[PDB]
């Protein structure tokens, strides 16, 4: 096959920044390169064909350049909604090799999480398992430390986190941490606490509840 | 071996259905002396009688039941469940008492794809009505006449999954089954083997 090698692998840029993504073909493709934008959980969307031609309805901040082996996609002024993975494609002939993608994430000002805690439901408890959920809502940057304390004892090996993809409007993230205990373990302790450390917090924030109260 | 009262008798007097509060009383029962009713009210719960909704997992309590002397009425079932899993060990329905004085087995408006009554060898008296189970196949494969103990017992299988649709989707007896039919698609569901 023809190889299509994209660089950089990822980038973090601010709103209004110029962004340049590169794609190198292993042989001469003339101008037979297309570019796509893929948002998470969505199908790729066609941006550019024949290396430099803007597909109908695509914003003019997107442009493409190059011929032969070296091709570039430029976003003249990055917008928050431009968070995506961008792909080049060898568009002629088969097998139409796609590049490995470049992930573009948005850099913005610090924003503190709003923190919430949720006890297990009585419905789940009758089933023999307790899930305790901590929510960190709408924060930046992504990096956060979230720790579970049960009657002041730090928990390890019994929680998992999930983080949303960057919001296309304000570039923030949200995060869930879920602590899993047996009903028996859950019922032998009183205080359930989620402690959050983050750049936007002057000191860590704790949300907690007392079982049964 | 343990005999327990059915719905309407003893601990189950004035109960409409097996339900969250009464289902514990069937623990370890091998024979129901009376009838079993499983109704939508069981799963919805009932404010008037202070009955919480039945956790469908509690139905597993019934797996020890081998005999019902009266009738079995099932008009609600976890939509999640493809067969009558809790009754996989039921061997005999006697129909000494019958629903409306007529029916010993009534399986009505469920989401099941097969009956799964793999241990059932006899329905001594009463009619069988299998009605309105839109996903249900396999029921017409059973030789009901052979399960029956009283001349003139009837089986009516109405408004379940169309015969053509069961054939088109492959929901017919496994190749390993004899002509006696089956309770579902698996070799364990065959009434008898080839």
């Amino acid at each position: 096959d023809i190889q299509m090698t994209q660089s950089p692998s990822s980038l973090s840029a601010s709103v209004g920044d110029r962004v340049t993504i590169t794609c190198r073909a292993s042989q001469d493709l003339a101008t037979d390169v297309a570019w796509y934008q893929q948002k998470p959980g969505k199908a790729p969307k066609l941006l550019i064909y024949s290396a430099s031609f803007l597909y109908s309805g695509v914003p003019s901040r997107f442009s493409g350049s190059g011929s032969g082996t070296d091709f570039t996609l430029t976003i003249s002024s990055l917008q928050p909604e431009d968070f995506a993975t961008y792909y080049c494609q060898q568009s002629e002939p088969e097998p139409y090799t796609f590049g490995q993608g470049t992930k573009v994430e948005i850099k913005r000002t610090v924003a503190a999480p709003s923190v919430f805690i949720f006890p297990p439901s009585d419905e789940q408890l009758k089933s023999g398992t307790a899930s305790v959920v901590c929510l960190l809502n709408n924060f930046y940057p992504r990096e956060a430390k979230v720790q579970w304390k049960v009657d002041n004892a730090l928990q390890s090996g019994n929680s998992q986190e999930s983080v949303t993809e960057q919001d296309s409007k304000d570039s923030t993230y949200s995060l869930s941490s879920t602590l899993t205990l047996s009903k028996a373990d859950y019922e032998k302790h009183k205080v359930y606490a989620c402690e959050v450390t983050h750049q936007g917090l002057s000191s860590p924030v704790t949300k907690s509840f007392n079982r049964g109260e | 071996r343990k005999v327990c009262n059915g719905i309407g008798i003893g601990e189950f007097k004035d109960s409409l259905s097996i339900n969250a509060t009464n289902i514990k009383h069937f623990k370890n029962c091998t024979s129901i002396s009376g009838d079993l009713h499983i109704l939508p009210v069981a799963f919805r719960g009932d404010s008037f009688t202070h009955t919480p909704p039945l956790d469908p997992q509690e139905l597993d309590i019934l797996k020890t039941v081998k005999e019902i002397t009266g009738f079995l009425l099932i008009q609600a079932w976890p939509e999640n469940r493809t067969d009558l899993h809790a009754f996989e060990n039921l061997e005999i329905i006697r129909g000494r008492t019958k629903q409306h004085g007529q029916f010993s087995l009534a399986v009505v408006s469920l989401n099941i794809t097969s009956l799964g009554l793999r241990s059932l060898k006899e329905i001594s008296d009463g009619d069988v009505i299998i009605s309105g189970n839109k996903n249900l196949c396999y029921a017409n494969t059973i030789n009901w006449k052979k399960l029956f103990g009283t001349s003139g017992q009837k089986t009516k299988i109405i408004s379940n999954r169309g015969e053509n649709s069961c054939k088109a989707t492959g929901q017919v007896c496994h190749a390993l089954c004899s002509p006696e039919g089956c309770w579902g698609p698996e070799p364990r569901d065959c009434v008898s083997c080839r």
């Binding site: 199908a43 796609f98 439901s121 | -």
Partner: protein, 218 residues
């Protein structure tokens, strides 16, 4: 106006087979070229093959030749991807896409939403759904969607009438080998007594929908 919709994704045991469908609307498959492209979770795009429904000409990636094949029913305006002898590594979102006629090249101008095929020696399992009760200005509430397999589930609130402030988290595989996620929403605290909140969970791999009303705990 042009739309493509893939269906047929779900759990397949290793060694098993599956046929995916791609329903076109707004244009006829006959007269155009359609491509199948897949994407393993967190990975890049891989072209699989193409078909001209008119004439029935097909071409395939070397990686799947002999195992995957493409067909089309012009009366149904639907294309198909037949996949034999599936392996764990074939786990991916499968897309169909129309080849554009803006130019000579195979720029792909319309894509379906994709359908997720999971190849695993595991069992299909529908989700348990538990409320994340509010009030513990703004109230947060949600649903915990736990212990399902395979992916994916979708979640809406009040049948899609509530979208503002909703976060449905990426599923995470638990140590049990079953997925779990939460969907949360923030709403005015003052609305808790006057607005019903229901999460609608769809687990297409097990053909299961679940609705859960989430209310303040008493």
């Amino acid at each position: 106006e042009v739309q493509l919709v893939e269906s047929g994704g779900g759990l397949v045991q290793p060694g098993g087979s599956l046929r995916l469908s791609c329903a076109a609307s707004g244009f006829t498959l006959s007269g155009d070229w359609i491509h199948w492209v897949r994407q393993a979770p967190g990975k890049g795009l891989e072209w699989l093959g193409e078909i001209s429904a008119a004439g029935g000409y097909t071409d395939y990636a070397d990686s799947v030749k002999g195992r995957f094949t493409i067909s089309a029913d012009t009366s149904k305006n639907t294309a198909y991807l037949q996949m034999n002898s599936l392996r764990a590594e074939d786990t991916a979102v499968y897309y169909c896409a129309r080849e554009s006629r803006v130019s000579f090249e195979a720029a792909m101008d319309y894509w379906g939403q994709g359908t997720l095929v999971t190849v695993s020696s595991a069992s299909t399992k529908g989700p348990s759904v538990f409320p994340l009760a509010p009030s513990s200005g703004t109230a947060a509430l949600g649903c915990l969607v736990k212990d399902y397999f395979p992916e994916p589930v979708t979640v809406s609130w009040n049948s899609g009438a509530l979208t503002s402030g909703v976060h449905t988290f990426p599923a995470v595989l638990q140590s049990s080998g079953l997925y779990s996620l939460s969907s949360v929403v923030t709403v005015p605290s003052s609305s808790l007594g006057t607005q019903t909140y229901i999460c609608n969970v769809n687990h297409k791999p097990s053909n299961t929908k679940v609705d859960k009303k989430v209310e303040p705990k008493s």
